Amino acid sequence: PKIANIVINDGTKDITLQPVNIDREGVAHFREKDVSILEAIRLTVQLRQPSVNGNVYRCKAKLVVPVVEVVGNVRTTVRTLTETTEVLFTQDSLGTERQRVANLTKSLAGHATLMSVVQDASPIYG
Amino acid sequence: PKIANIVINDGTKDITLQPVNIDREGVAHFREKDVSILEAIRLTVQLRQPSVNGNVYRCKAKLVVPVVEVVGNVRTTVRTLTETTEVLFTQDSLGTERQRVANLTKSLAGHATLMSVVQDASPIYG
Amino acid sequence: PKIANIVINDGTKDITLQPVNIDREGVAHFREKDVSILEAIRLTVQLRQPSVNGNVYRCKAKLVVPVVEVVGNVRTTVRTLTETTEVLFTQDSLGTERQRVANLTKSLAGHATLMSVVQDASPIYG
Amino acid sequence: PKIANIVINDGTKDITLQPVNIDREGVAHFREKDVSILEAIRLTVQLRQPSVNGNVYRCKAKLVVPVVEVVGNVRTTVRTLTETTEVLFTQDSLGTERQRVANLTKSLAGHATLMSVVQDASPIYG
Amino acid sequence: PKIANIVINDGTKDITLQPVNIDREGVAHFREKDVSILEAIRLTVQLRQPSVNGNVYRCKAKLVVPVVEVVGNVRTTVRTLTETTEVLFTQDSLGTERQRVANLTKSLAGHATLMSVVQDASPIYG
Amino acid sequence: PKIANIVINDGTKDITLQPVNIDREGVAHFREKDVSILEAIRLTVQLRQPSVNGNVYRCKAKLVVPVVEVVGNVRTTVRTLTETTEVLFTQDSLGTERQRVANLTKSLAGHATLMSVVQDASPIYG
């Protein structure tokens, strides 16, 4: 779609990601609004078209959340938390099919057990 | 959490994923209920604990949606659509921090522009 | 002009081409709405601006119509028809001149004898 | 018994250990609630059933208490204290016998002189 | 920010620069309203992100004012006057800092002696 | 114009740049008044006259703002922000044309959207 602001919620507030750059490879880069450059969340979104000898589409979205702290009166990033979503579908795929995959991805990432896997750092077990 | 059914929505109906298997590596496998084995959606969820010489946690969730069609009176899978979510955080991370990441992942995967990137097979552009 | 749906007509039905990509070369890719990616009619429109040394604009528009028929159980494109319009004008050109040329292009592509050349596949002779 | 929060007391405050993992070896890992992963008290509880040749059950429970103090701006575990209970019983053992042993273990761990051995770090002599 | 008309004054009148597009590199192009292509004032604005290696932002803004001679139907660019402004700031810079820089740039560009350098085509001396 | 103090404003306070050097290349170096040499804002302004073969004047003005913070007991420049204006005009250019360009440069550097590009560090998109 037309590149624009992306407003996502972090559980407590709404965060606005402003368009920043577009690669030669087609990756759309974003960055958090009203926040220091070093500590701003950033998001990259690309979609590899299939090869001439391939038929596979790759939609990759990487989100990065830094944590900056003041070390020796110098703001530095102690740790970053990353999340990568790759959706992959074939050139002969039907619109209904990839719409199903989109909605499954949504429900999956919103499902309480999956969220708890990351919140509590506990694999699923038995 | 305790392994259980995972109920996710595909935009039109609710789909129930029943527990199936648990690897030696700790991966929880699931499969769609009331549907043929070959055409059933399946979901794997694991959380790599950090190494003894590392401090990095990897929570990986792969969802697979097959499309089966009858080819020569033999049901075969023409194409599969895949989605992989990897959340990655450090051993010294705070609970509030990884909760923020969980909710950001949710809002991201529900955001209309991101969903449209896959529904319409159109990168973000400018 | 702004990027939006291009609705054209094939003499019987109106085909809606949705904006799908903006190339790194500046090419606006459109794809037929409500049709599988393989069998959709696609349209590319770019305006190559002149070099630092030159003063020549090239406006290129390629329409591609595929013919998809089912081979066994596999939908396959048997053949394709292609149309390419290319308009060249200089930087010292007047708007009124460019407009005159655009109208001539329209009148030409609507003219009975040229349409007959393509329909009947017989050139102008005798 | 069912897997659930284990609430124990340190003489002053009740620490709630939440169920976090069930190992591939059968180990139930618990982690202290509302505390950073690094500084949380953790408890592991497993019941190793006997081999095909043998008839000996081992019930192992390891409690680990870390001591985390801030070094500069970095929270670090200075030292740890560990407690390991291991109960062995045979397959021909009676429930009443096993229960007698469990009660003896409780009475023993509550006994003033053993608690004094660990608190005062002085063994039994003279 | 959001692409829109840019109105700037030339000391005698207000000149409206309408947006044209934004190319693959990220440069936003503007063209003077209601004037021929050949003789229209042009403005380009980009904010080049730092590489993965570097941490340097480059904000580039180029203004181009042509002087055209028209004799009959012969239209030729006799000369051009151009001005290009580059602002460089680091990834860890403060919004306060680059706001001071923006205001200093505005003050310099308005300063009587800096303007006299260009108006009178003489350097600073005496 | 004559060489003298250049007084510019940073939106809050007026910084006085005193004439400090005239380069062998013709560059007028200015330095911030009442500030240590290391932490002073400095400004260079030169008018490169055309070659014997050419007819192109270059007017270059570089402002450098350092950010000095105390590291231990040693004052050190953490980072710097730089702005470079470069105006090009030909020898056949009219004074009125050069003046028009200077005023456009002023209006441009004062314009809200460009100031916002540098302040908010977000380019023009959508």
Helix B95-110, helix B112-119: angle, nearest 10 = 50
Q: Which two tokens stand for residue C9?
A: 């007509």
CB contact under 8 A, C37 and A91: yes
- CB < 8 Å to A73, chain F: 69-71
Rounded to whole angstroms, the Cα distance separating E107 from F7 reads 9
Q: Which two tokens stand for residue F70?
A: 């105390």
Q: Which of B24, B26, B92 sits opposite D38 (nearest CB)?
A: B92
Of the candidates F74, F76, F85, F66, the residue with the CA atom closest to the CA atom of residue F15: F66
**What count of residues does chain A have?**
126
CB contact under 8 A, C36 and A94: yes
Beta-carbon contacts of B57 under 8 Å, excluding residues fewer than 6 positions away, are A121, B47, B48, B49, B50, B88, B89, B90, B91, B93
Q: Would you say A115 and B25 are in contact if contact means Cβ atoms under 8 Å apart?
A: no
Rounded to whole angstroms, the Cα distance separating E102 from E100 reads 5
How distant, in Å, are the alpha carbons of A94, B36, D96, E4 from that of B67? 10, 11, 58, 46
b/e map A19-57, b = 16+ CB within 10 Å: bbbbeeebbbbbbbbeebbeebbbbbbbbbeeeeeeeeb
Method: X-ray
CB contact under 8 A, E1 and F117: yes
Give me the amino acid identity at C79: R
Query: Do E and D make contact, counting contact as 3+ CB pairs within 8 angstroms?
Result: no
**What count of residues does chain B have?**
126
- Give A71→chain B minimum CA distance, Å: 16
How distant, in Å, are the alpha carbons of A85, B57, B79, B116, E52 from that of A60? 6, 21, 19, 13, 18
* Cα-based torsion angle of the residue sequence B8, B10, B13, B15 in order, rounded to the nearest 10 degrees: -40
- Give C91→chain E minimum CA distance, Å: 6
Residue with tokens 């860890």: E92
* Cα-based torsion angle of the residue sequence B16, B22, B25, B28 in order, rounded to the nearest 10 degrees: 10
**Residue D83, Cβ neighbours under 10 Å: how many?**
12
Q: Which two tokens stand for residue B6?
A: 């995972």
Q: What is the DSSP string of F49-83?
A: PPPSS--EEEEEEEEEEEEEEEETTEEEEEEEEEE
Question: What DSSP element (H or E) covers D104?
Answer: helix D95-109
CB contact under 8 A, C91 and E38: yes
Phi, psi of D33, rounded to the nearest 5 degrees: -80, 140
Checking DSSP bridges between strand B56-71 and strand B42-48, what pairing results, if any? antiparallel
Q: What is the DSSP string of B28-40?
A: EEEEETTS-TTT-
Q: What is the DSSP string of C12-81?
A: SSEEEEEEEEE-TTS-EEEEETTS-TTT--EEEEEEEPPPSS--EEEEEEEEEEEEEEEETTEEEEEEEE
- Give C106→chain B minimum CA distance, Å: 30
DSSP letter, residue A35 = S
Residue with tokens 């456009």: F104
Rounded to whole angstroms, the Cα distance separating A43 from B108 reads 10
Checking DSSP bridges between strand B56-71 and strand F6-9, what pairing results, if any? unpaired
- Find the farthest-apart pair of alpha carbons in chain D and give their distance in angstroms, rounded: 57
Rounded to whole angstroms, the Cα distance separating B123 from B114 reads 9
Rounded to whole angstroms, the Cα distance separating E27 from D90 reads 79
Q: Which two tokens stand for residue A91?
A: 């050139």
- CB < 8 Å to B7, chain A: 111
Of the candidates B87, B95, B81, the residue with the CA atom closest to the CA atom of residue B56: B87
Checking DSSP bridges between strand C6-9 and strand C14-22, what pairing results, if any? antiparallel
Q: Which of F71, F121, F123 sits opposite A37 (nearest CB)?
A: F121
CA C94 to chain centre: 24
Of the candidates A112, D90, F108, F55, the residue with the CA atom closest to the CA atom of residue E7: F108
CB contact under 8 A, E76 and C92: yes
Cβ burial of B83 (10 Å; 0-12, 13-18, 19+) is buried
Coil/strand/helix, residue E33 = coil
**Residue D39: closest CA among chain B residues belongs to which residue?**
B92
How distant, in Å, are the alpha carbons of A25, E49, F116, F120 from that of E89? 25, 10, 14, 12
Q: Which two tokens stand for residue F114?
A: 């460009």
How distant, in Å, are the alpha carbons of A12, A122, B27 from that of B55? 27, 14, 20
Of the candidates E9, E66, E73, the residue with the CA atom closest to the CA atom of residue E38: E66
E80 torsion bin: left (phi>0), alpha (psi -120 to 50), beta (else): beta
CA C27 to chain centre: 12
Question: What DSSP element (H or E) covers C107?
Answer: helix C95-109
Of the candidates F122, F43, F24, the residue with the CA atom closest to the CA atom of residue F85: F43
Q: Which two tokens stand for residue E42?
A: 């042009």
Chains that touch B (3 or more CB pairs under 8 A): A, C, D
Rounded to whole angstroms, the Cα distance separating A122 from B19 reads 17
Q: Which two tokens stand for residue F94?
A: 């009219």
How distant, in Å, are the alpha carbons of E67, E70, E120, F82, F91 from that of F94? 10, 18, 10, 31, 8
* Cα-based torsion angle of the residue sequence C31, C35, C40, C45 in order, rounded to the nearest 10 degrees: -10
Give me the amino acid identity at A63: L
Per DSSP (E only), the strands in chain B are: 6-9, 14-22, 28-32, 42-48, 56-71, 74-90
Suggest the residue from C20, C31, C36, C37 to mutate for an interface test with chain A (most A CBs closer than 10 A).
C37
Rounded to whole angstroms, the Cα distance separating A24 from E83 reads 27
Q: Would you say A43 and A36 are in contact if contact means Cβ atoms under 8 Å apart?
A: no
Q: Would you say A46 and A26 are in contact if contact means Cβ atoms under 8 Å apart?
A: yes
Question: ∠ CA B22-B23-B26 to the nearest 5 degrees?
Answer: 85
Q: Would you say F81 and F94 are in contact if contact means Cβ atoms under 8 Å apart?
A: no
Residue with tokens 């908010």: F120
**Residue D42, Cβ neighbours under 10 Å: how many?**
17
Rounded to whole angstroms, the Cα distance separating B25 from B68 reads 29
Per DSSP (E only), the strands in chain F are: 6-9, 14-22, 28-32, 42-48, 56-71, 74-90
Coil/strand/helix, residue B106 = helix
Of the candidates E92, E93, E117, E48, the residue with the CA atom closest to the CA atom of residue F43: E117
Q: Would you say F65 and F31 are in contact if contact means Cβ atoms under 8 Å apart?
A: no
How distant, in Å, are the alpha carbons of B103, C15, C17, F84, F113 from that of C9? 46, 6, 11, 53, 42
Rounded to whole angstroms, the Cα distance separating C64 from C41 reads 6
Question: ∠ CA E103-E105-E108 to the nearest 5 degrees?
Answer: 110
**Residue B92: closest CA among chain D residues belongs to which residue?**
D38
How distant, in Å, are the alpha carbons of E84, E123, E126, F63, F89 from that of F58? 11, 11, 20, 16, 7
Give me the amino acid identity at A10: D
CA F61 to chain centre: 4
Cβ-based interface (< 8 Å): residues of A facing C = 2, 24, 26, 91-95
DSSP letter, residue A116 = H
Q: Would you say D106 and D114 are in contact if contact means Cβ atoms under 8 Å apart?
A: no
Give me the amino acid identity at F56: V
Q: What is the stated resolution of the deposited model, in angstroms?
A: 3.1
